[PDB]
Amino acid sequence: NIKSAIKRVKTTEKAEARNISQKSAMRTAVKNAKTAVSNNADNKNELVSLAVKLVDKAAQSNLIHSNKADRIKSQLMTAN
Amino acid sequence: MAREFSLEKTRNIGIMAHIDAGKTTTTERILYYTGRIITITSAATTAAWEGHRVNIIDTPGHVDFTVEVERSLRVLDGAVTVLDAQSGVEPQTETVWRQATTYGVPRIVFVNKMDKLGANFEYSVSTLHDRLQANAAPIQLPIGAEDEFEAIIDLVEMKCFKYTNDLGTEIEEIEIPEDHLDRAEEARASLIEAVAETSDELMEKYLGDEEISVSELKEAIRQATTNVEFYPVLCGTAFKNKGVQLMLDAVIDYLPSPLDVKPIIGHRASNPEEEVIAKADDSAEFAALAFKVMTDPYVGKLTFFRVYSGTMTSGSYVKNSTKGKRERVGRLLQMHANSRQEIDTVYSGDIAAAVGLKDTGTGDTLCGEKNDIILESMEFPEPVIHLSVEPKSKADQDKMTQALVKLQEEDPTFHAHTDEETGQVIIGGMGELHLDILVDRMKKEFNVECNVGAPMVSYRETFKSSAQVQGKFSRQSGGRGQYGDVHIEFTPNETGAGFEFENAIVGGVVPREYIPSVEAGLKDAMENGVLAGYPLIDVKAKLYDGSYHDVDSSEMAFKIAASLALKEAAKKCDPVILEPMMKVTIEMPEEYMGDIMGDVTSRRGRVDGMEPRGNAQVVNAYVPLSEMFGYATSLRSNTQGRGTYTMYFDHYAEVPKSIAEDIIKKNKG
RNA sequence: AUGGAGAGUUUGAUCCUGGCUCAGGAUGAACGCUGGCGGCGUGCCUAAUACAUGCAAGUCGAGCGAACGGACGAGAAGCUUGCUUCUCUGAUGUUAGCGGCGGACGGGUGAGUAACACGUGGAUAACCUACCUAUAAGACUGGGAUAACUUCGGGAAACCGGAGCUAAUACCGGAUAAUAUUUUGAACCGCAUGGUUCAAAAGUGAAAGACGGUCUUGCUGUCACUUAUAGAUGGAUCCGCGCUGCAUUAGCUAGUUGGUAAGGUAACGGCUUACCAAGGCAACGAUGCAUAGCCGACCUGAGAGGGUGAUCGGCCACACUGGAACUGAGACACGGUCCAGACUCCUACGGGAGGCAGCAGUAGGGAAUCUUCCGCAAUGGGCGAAAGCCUGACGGAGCAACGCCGCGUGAGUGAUGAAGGUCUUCGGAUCGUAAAACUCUGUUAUUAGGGAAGAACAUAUGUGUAAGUAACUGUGCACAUCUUGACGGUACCUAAUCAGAAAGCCACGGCUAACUACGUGCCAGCAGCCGCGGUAAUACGUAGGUGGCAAGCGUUAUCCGGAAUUAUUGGGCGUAAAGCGCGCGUAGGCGGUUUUUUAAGUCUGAUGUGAAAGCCCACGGCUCAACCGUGGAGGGUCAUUGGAAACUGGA
Ligand SMILES: CC(=O)O[C@H]1C[C@@]2(C)[C@@H](C[C@@H](O)[C@H]3[C@@]4(C)CC[C@@H](O)[C@@H](C)[C@@H]4CC[C@@]32C)/C1=C(\CCC=C1CCCC1)C(=O)O
Ligand SMILES: Nc1nc2c(ncn2[C@@H]2O[C@H](COP(=O)(O)OP(=O)(O)O)[C@@H](O)[C@H]2O)c(=O)[nH]1
Ligand SMILES: [Mg+2]
Ligand SMILES: [Mg+2]
Ligand SMILES: [Mg+2]
Ligand SMILES: [Mg+2]
Ligand SMILES: [Mg+2]
Ligand SMILES: [Mg+2]
Ligand SMILES: [Mg+2]
Ligand SMILES: [Mg+2]
Ligand SMILES: [Mg+2]
Ligand SMILES: [Mg+2]
Ligand SMILES: [Mg+2]
């Protein structure tokens, strides 16, 4: 094993923990917004806005690709 | 850069002794002491003692493994001969002593096992004097025997060392006890007399009654030892750590260096008559002798060699003058008590291991590329036991041949050859133990399971009675007609004279064209056995009459006639079976002569005679080769391992009635 | 026009047919004998067999805390003012760790792959792209942790946990910003789907500081950071055509083929799922089986063709075997992770570890293929502001007649045909101008001196100039100076000494250049074919001589040629091998005369491309040559586009 490889293992584990937390949060927001739009709720627009916020922040963190975020926003805001 | 130890501080020594004398224990203790401010492996181990480099080779004791002793004494400078205190000199002690004498190696004797019950230092020294006829004298005295053994009196410096424990530490240097002072002075006088018997200056100095200086006495002892005229005898117990330091001190003080040793003589490859003296000089050309070859599972093939003259650096090319090829020295290793070290250079008087030598067997000479010197090789004993070997599964015969080749390269004393007459592969070795170990090694290491037995004896046939016989063959009945006829007198020839064909034809009754065909037919029919299938020998065939047809006569017809004549002569002449008889010369002490002669006569052989030779006796006899199976083991049992023998084919003799009948029955069915 | 040779052998003899064989060229060759040197190349083709050991990927202190360290230089005098502690300052420096970037390149291998893998030509209005370049706009305001470290505990080791504390260009909230997303209107355009631009609004997150200059903490340089649009680079997908053997492999396919909806992806798409339908492929060879990395090229041939896919370049695929994802611009990752498997190793028996198809090397296999070498000086790469560090890439050296090319092993005179070998017709012939001897030379060799180029730089130090500045330091550019070589004191040059150290291999019956004597006597032996050898052997072995080559010469193996002997070029089937025993008839192949029309074939012009290296031609540089370099020419059944209508094809 190479010293830099061992270091990369450590940093990869840290980055994975952070990324999976953020991705799970954004997926939860997306599902909540989709449910709110599907069944009209007074919180619909705020939930959709939160979902879009998290989707774009994920795209900027590189967790998802820009086109993936674009598809999510397109479908969410077309439903809403 | 610079050799860490000079030639004046190098000691190449070998530990040799009878079985269980303590060679391995002594080597282990030596390595431990040299390494402190232990696994023994590899041909030689390198250590340091008091600013001196010490190469140690531990040898085997069994007579079956005399190859190792030979190949080590060839390249070594000094030897430590270990003796069990309770028994002194034993048969293999004598054998290794004679090998060291043949190689002119200085020796120091070390009486180990002083703590063992029955230990008797005086008796061991007396055995040195009597059994070996060696000018050996103690340079020490033991205070105590068996459990009482507690001190050693160095006589050169008249100083007592008292050992307070078995750990080998906390030795007290004190003055000789008063009660032992007279004995110590007498022993010192005896030692001085022994050395003076070789040194004239010391003899005059001692006769003058003037006190001998410690340095002068040490110098005289060193001179005598290196001349191989004196043998210092020490004592101790390697198991309980007593006398090991003194033994190492004696190694330093008395055993020679590669300078003190006599030079080495070699032959130029292009001028065999030319002689080259290779002295221990780093600045001279590089010449070394490869004395061991092995395969280490980590580094590959290792070639252990001793360097006599010159220097050689790792990562270079050398010449194998014996094989006349170029070898790449890629890596040089030296084995220490606990680890192997890669060393960039080897100098005269160094034992090292090369990695990467291909086609370099034991006894080869490695010389500088430009040079072409060839050092003297080693002579090893001829096989004393032979066994017909054969794989249990014929599918492994190629593996068996390859294993035999590799084993022969590893071990000079192990031979394998194919016998044309019997078509059997025969393995020859130094003893039953040697062959058993080799068979097991072939079975396991080389994964070729083999079975071994007594070699087959190629018998012969002969005619005991003379007779005139006729052979006629008429085949005119169908198609081509053939006719042949011969009259031949068969006579028992003088034993060993071979087949003799005579042509007493008068009047051209047998045309001269067909006579060679008749002789050839006789030769073929005799090659084919007439009584048991073995070739017929010692016969005089006299073609004295015959007939022929102007057309039907042919070479094949006359060969048929000769074959029929031989068949009828076999019917009429009472053939007998002959067995090879070996001229056997047995050397042994006279006290076993009766046993040896009894065994000879019990082997169906006869004692030709007896004669003294040196300090032993030689018995000459003739024994059947079949009855000579397993003779070495019986001889060693009869002579306590002191008996040796040689055998060579001598002649053929008639097999007794019962044995011949058994042979005939076996061949028939 | 640049280019094409044949011979032996079936018979008593002949012509034909017909196979066999030979003369040529080639090689990553091996072996046998032999072996002087230099230059340039090439060197595990077998076991994608297993691997001891060393090395092959690090770097950044000008991102960060901490630790070690201790100049310059404080204090008391031990009365030693030269040695001394802690109460200091502590600079030049070094590091384990956090963080950034690089570990996806470079290097190895050809196992798998018959497939859009590759080649060639196209397409993407179905796509993605860190570092780099350009332009424009920004970089505001707060916060919580954690490594390190200290401590306690458990371990043979691998190393593990608990507690407490601290940093950042590490992480997170909020603020403003959009060509990105939703909706509405408008303009224009295209190859269906659609594309480009403008105007309105609603949802909406980015960022960071480090080292300096001016010092007015205001301004500001370099580097770094963020958003957007372009360029460059790299990658992805699709398509026409081309690219292999077998039918003693004929049926294959059920997410299979299409549609609808959704999901999924950078992206289109049965890519996946649900539903409906029964479609899709195939004698134009599906499916199955076997074998195989493909190409530029390489060998051979007059060509057409045939054979091959080392070295070098491109593309692909793989990293003990199989699966998977993580991080990341980029991997489903040779010297990363997880799981499973085989195998192997260490262990204190509690438990741990590994993957040379990287460079060397080991073992093994094999007829057979090298050093566990030197250096980053050159070129290239990663990191760094830079010096610099790393770099088994690479540049060199070492070994091997393995190949090609060059030069040696001497030159002149020398009849007096010397000795001696071999033959003889016993005169002589021949080895032979060969030798001897006299003269000459030193390529080579030995010795002693001189001694390159490859080296550009970068950095540092001086100025000059240009954008910006309020002005510097800096930044770009230009001119100068110090310094940088593993090879290596090697190449090369000079001076002296000696023909002195340096020739072997095969063949001599015909093919096929070169003949005699002895020995042998169908024996020993030779042999590519025909054959030779039983007493007169140019064929076996030796000797003299001769022939061909020569540091090589022979043998074996394999490929093309000769072979028109699979015949398109370029053959045949009465009797030599070859007409189905004969009809009827399907697909296919082929098809009578004239007129009009089309332009698929056919012919012709333009444009792009067919990398580089290679082959061929020319020129230039190594003293020559090989070799190296530079131009030219060539190579498509290639594509787009414009033209002609005789023939074939269509109407
Ligand atoms: C000094 C040392 O180390 O001796 C060793 C080394 C040793 C001499 C060995 C005996 C034997 O195996 C030897 C042979 C000849 C065996 C055949 C080949 O394998 C060769 C290559 C091999 C070479 C040497 C070898 C390996 C030893 C030995 C004797 C063992 C004792 C026994 C008692 C009865 C059973 C056996 C010893 O311990 O004295
Ligand atoms: N009593 C006693 N035993 C000893 C001594 N030296 C060795 N031994 C033992 O005797 C045997 C000798 O064997 P070893 O040393 O291998 O001898 P080798 O056959 O010469 O190699 C072993 O069992 C040793 O332990 C000694 O000095 N005294
Ligand atoms: Mg022993
Ligand atoms: Mg393959
Ligand atoms: Mg041709
Ligand atoms: Mg990697
Ligand atoms: Mg590896
Ligand atoms: Mg390798
Ligand atoms: Mg082998
Ligand atoms: Mg042809
Ligand atoms: Mg016929
Ligand atoms: Mg017919
Ligand atoms: Mg080209």
Among all protein residues, pick the one whose CA is nearest to the C1' atom of C325. Answer: A16
Closest by alpha carbon to B287, among B304, B271, B264? B264
At residue B113, the 3 state secondary structure works out as coil
| Closest Cα to atom 26 of ligand 2 | B113
Strand C at less than 7 A from CB of A46? no
Residue ranges of E strands in B337-440: 340-342, 345-347, 350-355, 365-368, 373-375, 385-391, 415-418, 425-429
Question: Read out DSSP for B453-516?
Answer: EPPPP--EEEESS-EEEEEEEEE-SSSS-EEEEEEEEEEEPPTTS--EEEE---TTSS-TTTHH
Cα of B293 vs centre of ligand 11, distance in Å, is 74
The finding on whether B119 has its CB within 6 A of some atom of ligand 2 is no
Domain boundaries, chain A: 1-80
Residue B616 host element (H or E): strand B616-624
Identify which of B64, B68, B384 to mutate to test ligand 1's pocket (most ligand atoms within 8 A of the CB): B68
State which CATH number among 3.90.1570.10, 3.30.70.3400, 3.20.20.210, 3.30.70.870 fits the domain covering B382-459.
3.30.70.870
At the top level of CATH, the class of B263-381 is mainly beta
Q: What is the CB neighbour count within 10 angstroms for residue B165?
A: 11
A5 C-beta less than 7 Å away from strand C? yes
Q: With contact defined as beta carbons under 8 Å apart, do B108 and B80 qualify? A: yes
Q: Which of B15, B18, B23, B25 to mutate to test the pocket of ligand 2 (most atoms within 8 A of CB)?
A: B25
Q: CA at B355, C1' at C626: how many angstroms apart? A: 40
Cα distances from B183 to residues B155, B176, B179, B180, B250, in angstroms, run 10, 10, 8, 5, 21
Task: List Cβ neighbours of B121 (8 Å cut-off, separation of 6 or more).
Answer: B85, B111, B114, B138, B141, B142, B145, B235
Q: Cα(B63)–Cα(B640) distance, rounded to whole angstroms?
A: 11
Q: How far is CA B513 from CA B269, B482, B502, B503, in A?
A: 54, 16, 15, 12
Angle between helices B200-207 and B178-196 (to 10 degrees): 140
Q: For residue B298, give the nucleotide whose C1' atom is nearest its CA.
A: C52
CB atoms within 10 A of CB B408: 16
| Complete DSSP assignment for B192-208 | HHHHHTT-HHHHHHHHT
CA-wise closest residue to B295 among B338, B346, B357, B209: B357
d(CA B355, CA B336): 17
Gap sites in chain A (C to N > 2.5 Å), preceding residue numbers: none
Angle in degrees, 0-180, between the axes of helices B91-102 and B66-75, rounded to the nearest 10 = 30
Nucleotides on chain C that have an atom closer than 7 A to a protein CB are 52, 57-59, 97-103, 127-129, 171-174, 178, 180-183, 202-206, 227, 263-267, 326-330, 333, 335-337, 354-355, 361-363, 365, 370-373, 399
- Nearest residue CA, atom 8 of ligand 1? B60
Q: Do domains B460-579+651-669 and B580-650 have the same CATH topology?
A: no
Q: Which 3 state secondary structure label does DSSP give B552?
A: coil
Tell me the C-alpha distance between B135 and B155, whole Å.
17
Q: Regarding beta strands B107-112 and B231-235, do their DSSP bridges make them parallel or antiparallel, or are they unpaired?
A: parallel
CA–C1' nearest nucleotide, residue B331: C372
What number of helices (H) and strands (E) belong to chain B? Answer: 15, 37
Residues facing residue B305 across a β-bridge = B290, B352
Exposed, middle or buried: residue A10 (CB in 10 Å: 0-12, 13-18, 19+)?
Answer: exposed
Domain boundaries, chain B: 2-262, 263-381, 382-459, 460-579+651-669, 580-650
Tokens 């003297």 appear where? B376
Q: Which atom of ligand 1 is nearest to the CA of B410?
A: 21
Measured from the CB, is A20 under 7 Å from any atom of strand C?
Answer: yes
Name the 3-class secondary structure at A41. coil
**Ligand 13 geometric centre to CA of B362 (Å):** 60
- Going by the DSSP 8-state scheme, the letter that residue B592 receives in this structure is G
| Closest ligand by atom to B402 CA | 9
Assigned fold of B580-650 = Alpha-Beta Plaits (3.30.70)
Binding residue positions of B for GTP? 17-24, 58-62, 112-115
Nearest-angstrom CA–CA distance, B232 and B106: 10
Looking at domain B460-579+651-669, its CATH architecture is: 2-Layer Sandwich (3.30)
Longest Cα–Cα distance in chain B: 116
Nearest to B304 by CA among B106, B108, B56, B26: B56
Check: CB of residue B621 under 8 Å from CB of residue B608: yes
By DSSP bridging, strand B45-49 and strand B52-58 are antiparallel
A40 Cβ contacts chain C strand, under 7 Å: no
Pocket test for ligand 1, best of B20, B291, B437 (most atoms within 8 A of CB): B437
Q: Identity (one letter) of the amino acid at B622? A: Y
Q: Pocket residues for ligand 1 (CB within 6 Å)? A: B 58-60, 65, 67-68, 410-411, 437-438, 441
- Residue B393's identity, in one-letter code, is S
Is the minimum distance from the CB of A48 to strand C below 7 Å?
yes
Cα B93 to Cα B66: distance, rounded to the nearest angstrom: 12
Q: From B16, B36, B18, select the one nearest B27 (Cα to Cα).
A: B16
Ligand 2 neighbour B234 (Cβ under 6 A): no
Spatial neighbors of B208 by CB under 8 A, at least 6 apart, are none
Read off the tokens for B256: 């020679």
Are B180 and B153 within 8 A, CB to CB? yes
Kindly state the DSSP code that residue B212 receives in the 8-state scheme.
P
Question: Is the CB of B317 within 7 Å of strand C?
Answer: yes
| Nearest C-alpha neighbor of B69 from the set B98, B45, B36, B40 | B98
Instruction: Tell me, in angstroms, the distance from the centre of ligand 11 to residue B380's CA.
Output: 79
B168: phi > 0 → left, psi -120 to 50 → alpha, else beta; which?
A: left
Class of CATH domain B2-262: alpha beta
> Which of A79, A38, A72, A74 lies closest to A54 in space, CA to CA?
A72
Q: Is the CB of B19 under 6 A from ligand 2?
A: yes
Experimental method reported for this structure? cryo-EM
The answer to whether the CB of B20 is under 6 A from ligand 2 is yes
Strand duo B644-654 + B575-588: pairing: antiparallel
Q: How far apart are the first and last CA of chain A?
A: 52
CB of B399 nearer than 7 A to strand C: no
Pairing between β-strand B350-355 and β-strand B275-278 as defined by DSSP bridges: unpaired
d(CA A52, CA A46): 10
Which of B65, B69, B384 has the most ligand 1 atoms within 8 A of CB, as the residue to mutate?
B65
Residue–nucleotide distance: A61 CA to C219 C1' (Å): 36
Q: How much distance in Å is there from the Cα of A16 to the middle of ligand 6?
A: 19
A39 C-beta less than 7 Å away from strand C: no
- Taking the C-alpha atoms of residue B331 and residue B313, their distance in angstroms, rounded to an integer, is 9
E runs forming strands in B113-245? 136-138, 140-143, 151-154, 159-163, 171-174, 231-235
CA B67 / ligand 12 centre spacing (Å): 90
Place of tokens 């299938």: B533
CA–CA gap between residue B436 and residue B432 (Å, rounded): 6
In angstroms, what is the C-alpha Rg of chain B?
33
Question: If DSSP codes are grouped into helix, strand and coil, which group holds residue B126?
Answer: helix
Burial of residue B93 (number of CB atoms within 10 Å: 0-12, 13-18, 19+)? buried
Task: Please tell me whether any atom of strand C lies within 7 Å of the Cβ of A67.
Answer: yes
Q: Does strand C come within 7 Å of the CB of A24?
A: no
- What are the Cα distances from residue B300, in Å, to A27, B400, B405, B408, B446? 61, 22, 18, 18, 17
Name the residues around ion ligand 3, CB cutoff 5 A: B 23-24
Q: Which nucleotide is nearest to A48 (CA to C1')?
A: C203
Residues ≥6 apart with Cβ < 8 Å to B580: B457, B458, B459, B624, B625, B649, B650, B651, B652
Q: Is B522 exposed, middle or buried (0-12, 13-18, 19+ CB in 10 A)?
A: buried
Helix, coil or strand: residue B423 = coil
Query: Which value in Å is the resolution of this experimental model?
Result: 2.0
Do residues B607 and B619 lie in contact, with contact meaning Cβ atoms separated by under 8 Å?
yes
